[PDB]
Amino acid sequence: ELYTKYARVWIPDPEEVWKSAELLKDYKPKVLQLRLEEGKDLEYCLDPLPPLRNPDILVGENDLTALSYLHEPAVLHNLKVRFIDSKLIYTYCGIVLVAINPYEQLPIYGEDIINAYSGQNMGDMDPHIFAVAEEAYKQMARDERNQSIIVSGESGAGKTVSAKYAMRYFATVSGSANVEEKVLASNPIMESIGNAKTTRNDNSSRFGKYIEIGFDKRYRIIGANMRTYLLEKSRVVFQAEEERNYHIFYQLCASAALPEFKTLRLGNANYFHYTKQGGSPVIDGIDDAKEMVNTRQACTLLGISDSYQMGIFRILAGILHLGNVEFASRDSDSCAIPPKHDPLTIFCDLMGVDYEEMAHWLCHRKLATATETYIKPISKLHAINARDALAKHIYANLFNWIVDHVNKALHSTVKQHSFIGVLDIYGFETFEINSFEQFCINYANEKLQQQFNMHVFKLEQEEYMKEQIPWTLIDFYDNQPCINLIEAKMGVLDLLDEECKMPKGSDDTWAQKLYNTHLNKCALFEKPRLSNKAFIIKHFADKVEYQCEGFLEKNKDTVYEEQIKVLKSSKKFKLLPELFQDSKEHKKTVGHQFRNSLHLLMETLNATTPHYVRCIKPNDFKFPFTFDEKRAVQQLRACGVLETIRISAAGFPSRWTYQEFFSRYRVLMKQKDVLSDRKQTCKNVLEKLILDKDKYQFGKTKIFFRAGQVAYLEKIRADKLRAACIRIQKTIRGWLMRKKYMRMRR
Amino acid sequence: ETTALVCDNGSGLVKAGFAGDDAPRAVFPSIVGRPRHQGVMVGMGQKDSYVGDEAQSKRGILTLKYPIEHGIITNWDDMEKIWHHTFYNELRVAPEEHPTLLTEAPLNPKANREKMTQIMFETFNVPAMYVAIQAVLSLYASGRTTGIVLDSGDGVTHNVPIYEGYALPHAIMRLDLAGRDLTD
Ligand SMILES: Nc1ncnc2c1ncn2[C@@H]1O[C@H](COP(=O)(O)OP(=O)(O)O)[C@@H](O)[C@H]1O
Ligand SMILES: [Mg+2]
Ligand SMILES: [Mg+2]
């Protein structure tokens, strides 16, 4: 309880998530009279308290956990003032670095600052991405244990540029005669194959890129190794409204007029069924004909020969032409490709395969028992599904092959002693419409934040063992029940892979199975009130409503072996047989391939020690260096920052070294009372100032405080300092009064 | 996870394999042969009984018994030999470790499912078992939830109307002509 005249509080507002407010009448233990901006009128109805505000000296601190009052208003305010007023974009919460897109360039990344950060401990400096890279480089020396820097956030938050600078740090401080050129020259390739225009923004990354920087026995940089995970295969063949698929297809179509690409017989970017679907072939302000050239130049720099470059573009033109193969039904249970079909003719020319063999195998499938073998016609729906699954399989193998030749260039022969690994992964996502892609992204982010919450929980048990404080005080948010909802058997994914193979399964019967299995059995699964074709999962960040329409089309892969054996028979050019050179994997659905890829990522990260960077995007409009409250709060919830802050607020947020406590509160402690050691001095003085220890704890090295007690100490400190100023000023002012008085008497 | 075994005891053939396979790994005639002639050569290595393809190969020397006729198991010691051969020799799998989905023709005696279960749990010690009507599986196999399945084996013929996933058990016809009565 503190609320008085001249107190300040935060109040909610639909325009800006909180308004500052002056408390205009003292609180009495039932409705509050408040002054505001824009004059004053409110009375504010408490319900069976307003958030209460940190004294202005605290706000703007380097570390959001160093605040005395912790809540969403305080956090949003600190980040807003640091970004707008001080032009500082980096901030700490707990262990987490928080980074805000200044979204215009800055001096700050200079080599002078790189050198200034080297050797510094993370609390010695103002926050910067180099402070995280430096802490990683330290921890890799202090223990041989490898280190991971996990960069996460919405698309456009600056995850790629943050990784760029994090690598520039290692390459400056460790590096010597090169990795930097090759890694940065790889980006236009991986962006071309792996980024797409999403609804909310262009140039979204649809995969988790992981760069391992390798070090030798003396922590010189050896080289790098690039891995990729969680590739969004389904975008190759299906696109929502005003999406595109991966840029490479559009750079290719825009380059169709070039003489190398005449043979590929490409058309405009909406001639093909796999690029037409989105209805938006041109990005505003991107010239795809030139991004093509920057891609081919990046390939050339990484030493993919022009022969292989033309192989790559030949296969991509293959996929585009394949998409235009149209199947005619001849029966309810059989279909055929019409005679002399032009898209297939061009496809078989490009790939160098017999037209009538592909024409046969696209429309038929084959079974063999141990003795004897059968050839089945298939329905037009299964033919279209098989062709789409073949296109997805080609694209995924091409992607793994380009990544493998990049690794050929990035690897170096010296034996890697240890690595620091940097992970650029899309953040928790929520859109006015959410579909199977979003469901996968949010499941991956559930796993990553399980890891995060366990790491933080471990770290604070170990700090309490450094400080002999009971463990029972601390608890953590457990999101295993939602992972089990999505992932366990009879989970949302398991019933989807089942409905993919049950006869005449559909999104409507899938949804019915979900309701039957979970609707009132699980607390985290909910049905939307007015629909039968959607369901709600209560993720850590928010409730998200997913739409069942078109999960099953996106879910399905089965690649008919006979089509791979036709492609593997190709003799025209080197690359296409080489892709498929090394089963059950052909049956696996997109959801199951995603689950497995995510388990590989988590096996990679749990073997490591993480350091976290969260990136947030200030504004949707690309305005330089301005900030929107309503988005930023959504970002800071999606990053789990607000939960981390709340959890810390439940415990003992504020931790003061005894000597810093003295440096602050010498005014509180009497020139008589101070002892021959300040640790015992402050141990006494605080017991003087606050009667009950439960507000605080005494560690070996720090005083621990519950939230708010520091603001109290600053209040009483400032009132006592003003009473001292009253004494001294009153004496000097009274002297001048005396002086002029006696002059008048004189 | 452990796959289930899937095993179908036709009158004429055994088909067996693992769940999720697209076609059966073992198909062999469900036939047991015993030698019917004097054993003249010493040290040849006599055998009391052949099963399946072994009994086909030797069949000039053997009396061949079918242990299922008309979908009814008519002597159990042979059928237990046939299952022993199915798990251990053809699939090469420990039956301790896999659920087994068995199969049966509709409307046949109830003592046949009881014994066919008792032998799986006592003899083979299978973890878990099921028994499924033959004609129901052909709809899963043909992508349909509605149809009237005509199914005809070596031993039995039956119709099973299924509409929208409900069987109509009063309309089930069983007819006792099959491939073996065609052969005779
Ligand atoms: N720290 C920064 N300093 C200057 N510009 C930045 C910074 N972070 C992001 N940007 C700008 O924002 C753009 C979008 O961020 P980027 O990292 O490219 O996308 P994503 O984070 O989705 O990969 C960058 O291309 C760059 O123009
Ligand atoms: Mg990116
Ligand atoms: Mg049969």
CATH code for the domain of B62? 2.30.36.70
| Same structural domain, B13 and B46 | no
Backbone angles phi, psi at A110, to 5 degrees: -70, 155
Helical H segments across A435-559, by residue range? 436-467, 480-487, 492-501, 507-518, 551-555
Identify whether residues B94 and B124 lie together within a single domain: yes
Closest CA to A594 of A377, A430, A439: A439
Q: Which residue of A has its CA nearest to B145?
A: A503
Q: Which ligand has the nearest atom to the CA of B15?
A: 3
CA distance A526 to chain B (A): 28
Which three-class secondary structure string do you get for A32-59? EEEECCCCCCEEEECCCCCCECCCCCCC
- Spot the catalytic one: A205, A442, A453, A608: A205
Same domain, B127 and B85: yes
Annotated catalytic residue A160: yes
Is there a contact between B69 and B176 (Cβ–Cβ < 8 Å)?
no
CATH code for position B16: 3.30.420.40
Per CB-CB distance under 8 Å, the chain A contacts of B26 are 370
Contact status, residue A246 vs residue A192, Cβ threshold 8 Å: yes
What one-character-per-residue DSSP string does A268-283 give?
-TTSSHHHHTTS----
Instruction: Compute the nearest-CA separation of B52 from chain A (Å).
Output: 15
Q: B163 by DSSP, 3-state: which? A: strand
Q: Are residues B125 and B42 in the same domain?
A: no
Sheet containing strand A42-45, strands side by side: A8-12, A18-23, A31-35, A42-45
Say if CB A216 and CB A426 are below 8 A apart. no
Alpha carbon nearest to ligand 1 atom 23, residue = A160
Q: Are residues B58 and B74 in the same domain?
A: no
Residue B45: give the domain boundaries: 29-69
**Is B22 within 8 Å of A367 when comparing Cβ atoms?**
yes
Q: What is the distance in angstroms between the CA of the first residue and the CA of the last residue of chain A?
A: 56
A168 beta partners: none
Beta bridge partners of residue B167, listed in sequence order: B162
The angle, 0 to 180 degrees and rounded to 10, between the axes of the packed helices A179-194 and A380-410 is 170
A154 is in an annotated binding site: yes
The one-letter code for the residue type at A33 is Q
Name the closest ligand to CA A89: 1
Least Cα distance to B67 among B58, B78, B57 occurs for: B78
Query: Hey, what are A467's tokens?
Result: 């400080």
Nearest Cα residue to atom 20 of ligand 1: A156
Is A174 an active-site residue?
Answer: no
Q: Closest ligand 1 atom to the C-alpha of A155? A: 22
Those residues whose C-beta lies under 8 Å from the C-beta of residue A163, and which sit 6 or more positions away, are: A151, A211, A422, A424
**Pair B62, B120 in one domain:** no
Q: Is A156 left (phi over 0), alpha (psi -120 to 50) or beta?
A: left
What six digits make up the tokens of B159? 């119709």
Which CATH number applies to A447-555: 1.20.58.530, 2.40.50.100, 3.40.309.10, 3.40.50.170? Answer: 1.20.58.530
Is there a single domain that holds both residue B80 and residue B21? yes
- Please name the member of B24, B27, B144 whose beta carbon is closest to the beta carbon of A503: B144
* Burial bucket for residue A240 (CB in 10 Å: 0-12, 13-18, 19+): middle
Q: Which residue is associated with the tokens 């001095």?
A: A681
Residue nearest to atom 16 of ligand 1 (CA): A158
Q: Binding site annotation covers A160?
A: yes
Residue-wise over A357-395: b if at least 16 C-beta within 10 A, else e?
ebbebbbbbeeebeeeeeeeebbbebbbbbbbbbbbbbb
Helix or strand (DSSP H, E) at A611: strand A609-616
Q: Which residue has the tokens 């990260």?
A: A605
Structure tokens at A474: 């601390």
A377 has which bridge partners?
A: A364
> Are B19 and B83 part of one and the same domain?
yes
Q: Which residue has the tokens 């599986």?
A: B137
Residue corresponding to tokens 């399946």: B52
Residue B143 Cα distances to A278, A374, A382, B53, B172, angstroms: 32, 18, 12, 33, 21
DSSP secondary structure letters along A171-230: HHHT----HHHHHHHHHHHHHHHHEE--SS-SSEE-SEEEEEEEE-TT--EEEEEEEEE-
Q: How does strand B100-104 pair with strand B5-9?
A: parallel
Which residue matches tokens 């009448």? A25
The number of CA neighbours under 13 Å toward the Cβ of A4 is 3
Which ligand is closest in space to the CA of residue B68? 3
Considering Cα of A259, then A261, then A262, then A263, what sign does the dihedral take? Answer: positive
Instruction: Choose among A568, A559, A567, A564: nearest CA to A590.
Output: A559
With CB atoms and an 8 Å threshold, state whether B143 touches A370: no
Residue B92 sits in the same domain as residue B126: yes
CA A578, A424, A150 angle in degrees (round to 5)?
A: 130
A332 CB burial (10 A radius; 0-12, 13-18, 19+): exposed
Residues B77 and B126 in one domain: yes
Position A494: which residue type?
A: D
Give the pair of three-digit tokens for residue A619: 């504004």
Residues with CB under 6 A from ligand 1: A 101-103, 105-106, 155-161, 205
CB contact under 8 A, B27 and A369: yes
